[PDB]
């Protein structure tokens, strides 16, 4: 139940003569590849992004993908002619494809297609198929695409064999990055009156943040969303509703793998907060 490899594709279709396609690739929450519409070739975002594949093996994949990109555009533009509502530009196709890696040899692959921000089609087994809920008109396009056996055969090989094989390469190649421990640093601040505990710079994500009065955990601690930093570390804030006079005696406590059993305990004062 560990690392997930994601290839994220964003295709926009404005006119019947304007479109672009950009891609990002993630291994867990670290970006490994970039492929903007401008660039003829895929970019490495990490020194180890080529995985265990030889230059020639990598060339074979890049080429495989370059054919795919041009082909994808034209297929979609033609298939729009038989969509509903009739030629409904603009059109936003999103693809999410990769494989989730597990301990041992186990992995499960996926290819999900979203149309106008809604999940509509996946590749399942040997063919494309519309998911329950997906609009009626997609039936013909999927039937048409499923006639292209070459594509089916390729996609099968990619999902079943290529993905897991490549990603093992990455997980081994970028082991010292993926397993890095980055220490969180905390600070305090202030239509509900509250105190905010800022916790930034930690890696990986699993973190424990709680407002406390001594031994007692304050159950009113609201955990925020996890926000990314520019340097592949995490930012998170826990808030606590407090009225004037309830601040004294409170502290923010942070448990994180990188701290080695030594939690950050941050006490409040007159902006002069302390450890």
């Amino acid at each position, epitope marked *: 139940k560990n690392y997930t490899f994601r290839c994220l594709q964003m295709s926009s279709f404005a006119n019947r003569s304007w479109s672009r396609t950009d891609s990002v690739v993630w291994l867990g929450d670290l970006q490994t590849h970039r492929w903007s519409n401008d660039s003829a070739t895929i970019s490495f975002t990490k020194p180890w992004s080529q995985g265990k594949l030889s230059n020639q093996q990598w060339e074979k994949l890049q080429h495989m993908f370059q*054919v795919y990109r041009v*082909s994808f555009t*034209r297929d979609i533009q*033609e298939l729009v*002619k038989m969509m509903s509502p009739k030629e409904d530009y603009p059109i936003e196709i999103q693809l999410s494809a990769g494989c989730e890696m597990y301990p041992g040899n186990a992995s499960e692959s996926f290819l999900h297609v979203a149309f106008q921000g809604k999940y509509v089609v996946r590749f399942w087994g040997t063919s494309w198929q519309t998911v329950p809920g997906a609009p009626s008109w997609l039936d013909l396009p999927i039937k048409v695409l499923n006639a*292209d056996q*070459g594509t089916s055969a390729t996609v099968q090989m990619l999902l079943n064999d290529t993905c897991p094989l490549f990603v093992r390469g990455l997980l081994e190649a970028g082991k010292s990055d993926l397993e890095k421990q980055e220490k969180p640093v905390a600070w305090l601040s202030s239509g509900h009156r509250q105190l905010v505990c800022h916790v930034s710079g930690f890696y990986p994500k699993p973190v424990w943040v709680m407002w406390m009065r001594g031994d007692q955990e304050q159950q009113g601690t609201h955990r925020g969303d996890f926000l990314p930093n520019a340097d592949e570390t995490w930012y998170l804030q826990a808030t606590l509703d407090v009225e004037a006079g309830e601040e004294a005696g409170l502290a923010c406590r942070v448990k994180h793998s990188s701290l080695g059993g030594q939690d950050i305990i941050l006490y409040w004062h007159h902006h002069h907060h302390h450890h």
Partner: antibody
Framework: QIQLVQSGPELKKPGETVRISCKASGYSFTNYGMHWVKQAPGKGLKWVGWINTYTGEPTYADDFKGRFAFSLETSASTAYLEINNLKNEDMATYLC?????????????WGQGTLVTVSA | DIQMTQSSSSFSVSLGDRATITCKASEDIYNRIAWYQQKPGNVPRLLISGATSLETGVPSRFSGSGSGKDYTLSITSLQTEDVATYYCQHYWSSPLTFGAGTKLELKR
């Protein structure tokens, strides 16, 4: 059982019109569009164009614009090719073939063909 | 218009030999190529589409290959059953164009 049956051989004089038919069976007529291919005596295949069996919108290869017209009757799963003002250069066998659009236009199914002979 | 020019209009092969027919497109057609077999008196028969994918009817001695502009149809060992004309065809964009055909004949 996907099958295409065309009209019989036609013998026509220069200037006359011909109307070839092509009945499809074994698949939903509206699914695949209908393509037309010309083959003059020992000359190899030329794409005439195709017609969308759902919309009725035809597309003609440049060399066939004017004088060549695709029509169809969805009612009876039949496609038609009409050639007006027949010329000697038209004397050929015309084959209908069903395929999805143009970007999936590989022709797995062919009509038996209709030979049009042009002579005065 | 994309041109599809087949190297040879015809050549002779010794029965049993490996045959290779090359089809060259005037611009990159990214694998959207179909091969057809036609014998006098018959309709074209589709052999391979998508550069490499054989139709379920077709014997495995037939083989499709290539990329970009250059594509090849290959027969590992020609049988009498295989003397026919072979057409390549692209379906990358309109208009669809066929090659001129390569007629396979027997050496003697």
């Amino acid at each position: 059982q996907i099958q295409l049956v065309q009209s019989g051989p036609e013998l026509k004089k220069p200037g006359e019109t011909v109307r070839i038919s092509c009945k499809a069976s074994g698949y939903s007529f509206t699914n695949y569009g209908m393509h037309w291919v010309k083959q003059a005596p020992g000359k190899g295949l030329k794409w005439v164009g195709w017609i969308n069996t759902y919309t009725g919108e035809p597309t003609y290869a440049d060399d066939f614009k004017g004088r060549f017209a695709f029509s169809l009757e969805t009612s009876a799963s039949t496609a038609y090719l009409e050639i007006n003002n027949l010329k000697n250069e038209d004397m050929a066998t015309y084959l209908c073939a069903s395929a999805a659009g143009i970007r999936w236009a590989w022709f797995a199914w062919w009509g038996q063909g209709t030979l049009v002979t042009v002579s005065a | 218009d994309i041109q599809m020019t087949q190297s040879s209009s015809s050549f002779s092969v010794s029965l049993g030999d490996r045959a290779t027919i090359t089809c060259k497109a005037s611009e990159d057609i990214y694998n959207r190529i179909a091969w057809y077999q036609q014998k006098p008196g018959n309709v074209p028969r589709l052999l391979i589409s998508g550069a490499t994918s054989l139709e379920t009817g077709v014997p495995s001695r037939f083989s499709g290959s290539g990329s970009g502009k250059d594509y090849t149809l290959s027969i590992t060992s020609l049988q009498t059953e295989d003397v026919a004309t072979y057409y390549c065809q692209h379906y990358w964009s309109s208009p669809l164009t066929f090659g001129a055909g390569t007629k396979l004949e027997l050496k003697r």
